[PDB]
Symmetry: D2
Subunit: 198 residues, 4 copies
């Protein structure tokens, strides 16, 4: 693991406005640990609220993500084979719904996805492109799933990702911190929410 | 919680098959620059695999990180990992290692981001051939391998992770990323198992 | 075009799919966004769609749809102010009844001309192994031609059903069929297509 | 043709900074009427030099497109089924080179594609998003071809297209003028170069 600093990894990603905020799948099925798990997801959702309000106070473009399949499993995919309970994430299923504490407002965009990433076959890139977004704070679940996937795509799409370490949670803490490492060492700025805001 | 929330489900293999070898390039073969860890081993192991594909008629595509000579397309990825800039077309570091040298009509895919698919023709190329299951070998396990794997799932292809054919510079990062991929994104197996079943 | 090698034939190749682009109430009725030959295109598509279901082909439909607060109001809705009126539950945005979606049929929602742009449609077709995409919809010089180029670029063989695509104005319809024929597609009537497939 | 004004097509697309210039496929092959040129492409090439020169001294983001296929035809696609001459635009074939008149310098990106649009299977979108580009001047060839593909994708990608009326070119005036109509109507601000820079 010394190879990372030798070969020049983990360089700081300087921060640049305009800012935006992406919250990825903080949805009833991911908050409640009976369905799609809880390690530090419950905690992450709640801390995120400060950011969200911070977002709305500064006039930040904000985007929320939801995994949504079609009711007749029309768009059932390779993903929903590997993790079968994702098919159950239908448009009206309470389980697919954003959690009351992060409920969307005003001109904030809600993106429906059938993949891990909030960019993949969505209009997220162009929405942020259009709004001239340079740096993008990310929050959500899962750290080792949709978050990271969404985070690497933010990067590739041309956005300076800033991962809120205390605003992403997983059902599993080991994966949680390894994916923070990967991301810290390769794909974005990685700091807690009070730090980000400042 | 992973078991109890339905993860880990087998992803059956489905012909026709293809092979994607990601960033098996001198940069990543060579530990003074970007290599190290278990990268030298997956490269040799991948030869056996690349040979089989050649015998069986599969679509084979190779990936290479390539940034512009004048840093024209230097990007956010370039900022966390400034060395990725150094991989110019015609820098020997960007060249596919000689021992997996392309043939024939095997597609060499040029990318400037982690994933083989991002900002490239790989899905279209594979789509046109009707590949259903994609063997993936390459580096880095925790880097470009995982990005390509997740994107290949997202684009419709069943990912087949050849776990002794993917390498990283650090064993912790390598194991963690293989675990995520098996859980969520791919059928992970050894070349022996994959080759025989396919 | 012939001196430079254009409009070569594009041979047909199973598995077949069908795309129906934006045949919605807004686009079929002439005061809203419809007009011209769009309505007869809808009626000829019915026959194709029926055959697709019987043949077991993958069927996609598309719909233009913006968010209800206009949060995703983009550049396309600056050029064409009306498009923003295509909200999810707005009747204008709903597929025409003649062509209602059944069971396995994918409803692609979009806020741009192409059914491929920022949608999963390439990924949906590829999962199935569709090699040839039959295309119907409105508008020939809009969402069709954009969809036809994109399926071509995503590696699919576009078969444009020239009598199932329809437009506001004949000229653009005709000069966009021409392009599609010269650069992007097998273009042919729906009865040839149903025969050769 | 009345229908356009009545249903609200053709409304103004306001020019918004910062600006960016895209030049599509003004390559020797498309300047040369034996191969892919003809019509008003020659004159589009010459007028373009003025927009390019203004782009450089104004600090505008500049991207230039080229069509390029692999030497061994490994990326032969549906496009070159329909226009087989496309196969001969190989990386080092004179016909694939940007015409000397619009010789790129600088941090000017050159984007290599095998499809009509400069945006499809390329980094162009992420490239302009990182630079914060809001309005994108377009020029190139063919109007009824790669320029129309590029301008519709530009727009879709969240950028304000601006077709340089006299810097886009075709081999036939009928398709040229049909395509400017559609673009003027659904996709772009359309106006001459001097209108444009002023």
């Amino acid at each position: 693991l010394g190879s990372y600093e030798r070969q020049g990894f983990g360089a700081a990603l300087p921060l640049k406005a305009p800012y935006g905020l992406l919250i990825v799948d903080f949805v009833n099925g991911f908050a409640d640990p009976a369905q799609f798990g809880g390690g530090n997801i419950a905690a992450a959702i709640e801390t995120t609220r400060t950011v969200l309000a911070a977002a709305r106070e500064r006039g930040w473009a904000v985007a929320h993500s939801r995994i949504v399949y079609a009711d007749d499993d029309a768009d059932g995919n390779i993903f929903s084979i590997k993790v079968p309970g994702m098919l159950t994430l239908k448009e009206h299923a309470p389980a697919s719904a954003i959690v009351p504490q992060l409920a969307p407002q005003a001109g904030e965009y809600v993106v429906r996805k059938s993949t891990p990433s909030a960019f993949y076959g969505t209009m997220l890139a162009a929405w942020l492109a259009q709004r001239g977004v340079q740096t993008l704070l990310v929050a959500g679940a899962t750290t080792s799933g949709c978050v990271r996937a969404s985070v690497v795509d933010a990067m590739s799409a041309g956005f300076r990702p800033l991962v809120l370490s205390d605003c992403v949670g997983d059902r599993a803490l080991g994966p949680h911190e390894a994916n923070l490492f990967d991301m810290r060492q390769k794909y974005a700025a990685v700091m807690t929410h009070d730090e980000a805001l400042a």
